[PDB]
Design a binder for this molecule. Structure first.
Ligand SMILES: N#Cc1cncnc1N
Length: 295
């Protein structure tokens, strides 16, 4: 008999994810079906999104050889029925206060920082780069969380050293680039570019660096279709482009500039978006989402 979610203490709420205490050394990591676009959590959930992204994360944890926070199988009896397939039993870690970002391509705040200064997070780059330019080698572009409604703040390596220690900063940098490089090559082989990604790490009782959070999901990473990769223009979001096009199109009645909360999505846009998530998962994992556990 699976426990009720109400049996666990709620310890943290993020935009799309929830964290619960299971016991002194374990947490329940829960992905929801909520989707964010243009820095708004939208009214309309994407069916099965939490399950698909959990399946994705589990695949990539298994692909990477590095220590990670998983503490049980996806059907672990400590997982409540209501979140089965979109929740994981994980080891509680002392989390390091660094958003560990790898960028293989130049976009978003990385591109903006470069266009303003010629550098990103302390990396002085060649002249002549632009939107969706390939970055080789990939860059470690760490960030720190800001206030509730604010974007993360890009910082340089010295800032990371001041947060976690010199040797630990080195370790974060090296592991971030190593696992990004592996996952990105794997995805591209299957026709998907992982343009960038954001990791969080924690430390266990033995002082070991442990990969936590979710890894290489379309929420933590920019997914692009490789078949349409065209440097110099903004790449479509593999998963979210239908959502973005509808919100900013003539049928939504919404003005992006207004900063007013956007309206709910058409059901058919939500279902199409679910299909994109499944396609990305199945292409990258080589597995069938129909085999992934659920309620
Ligand atoms: N993910 C995650 C996490 C957060 N806080 C503490 N431990 C963890 N494994």
């Amino acid at each position: 008999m699976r426990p009720s979610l109400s049996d666990y203490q709620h310890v943290a709420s993020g935009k799309v994810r929830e964290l619960y205490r299971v016991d002194d050394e374990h947490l329940l990591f829960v992905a929801t079906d909520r989707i964010s676009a243009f820095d708004f959590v939208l009214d309309t959930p994407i069916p099965d999104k939490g399950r698909i992204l959990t399946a994705m994360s589990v695949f990539f944890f298994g692909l990477l050889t590095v220590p990670n926070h998983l503490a049980g199988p996806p059907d672990d009896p400590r997982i409540p029925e209501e979140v089965l397939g979109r929740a994981l039993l994980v080891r509680r870690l002392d989390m390091l206060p660094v958003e560990c970002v790898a960028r293989g391509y130049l976009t978003g705040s990385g591109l903006l920082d470069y266009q303003r200064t010629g550098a990103v997070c302390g990396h002085v780059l060649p002249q002549g780069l632009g939107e969706a330019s390939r970055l080789d080698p990939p860059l470690f572009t760490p960030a720190t969380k800001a206030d509730i409604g604010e974007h993360d703040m890009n910082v340089d390596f010295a800032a990371v050293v001041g947060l976690v220690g010199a040797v630990r900063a080195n370790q974060l940098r090296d592991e971030t680039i190593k696992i990004y490089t592996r996952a990105a090559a794997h995805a591209l082989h299957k026709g998907i570019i992982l343009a960038d990604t954001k990791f969080e790490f924690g430390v266990d009782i033995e002082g070991n660096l442990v990969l936590a959070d979710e890894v290489f999901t379309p929420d933590s990473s920019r997914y692009w279709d490789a078949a349409h990769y065209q440097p110099g223009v903004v790449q479509d979001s593999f998963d979210k482009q239908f959502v973005r096009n509808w919100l900013t199109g003539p049928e939504s009645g919404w003005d992006r500039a207004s900063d007013t909360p956007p309206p709910p999505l058409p059901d058919e846009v939500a279902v199409a978006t679910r299909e994109r998530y499944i396609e990305a998962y199945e292409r990258i994992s080589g597995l069938s989402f129909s085999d992934w556990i659920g309620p």
